[PDB]
Swiss-Prot record:
Residues 18-71 are annotated as: Sigma-70 factor domain-4. This is RNA polymerase sigma factor RpoS. The gene is rpoS. GO terms for molecular function: bacterial-type RNA polymerase core enzyme binding; DNA binding; sigma factor activity. Residues 44-63 bind DNA. The chain holds residues 245 to 330 of 330 of the full protein.
Amino acid sequence: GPEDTTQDDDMKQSIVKWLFELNAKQREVLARRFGLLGYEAATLEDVGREIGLTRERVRQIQVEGLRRLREILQTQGLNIEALFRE
């Protein structure tokens, strides 16, 4: 239907809109820890280095994001659980 209309691991594309909502971090942090949107799923250390930030930044910003991230998805009939549903 809306922005997403591809509810898979590709649903990360709708989370790409989350970048224009809260910041680019919430876009990249999920994708980098899950390996979505052509990103590479790595450890907190590896993913942190990839963006030039601390391990916490990728992990924990993602972790806190998981709560808010539902808001944009639920309004579109999308589920955040699909991002980690591998």
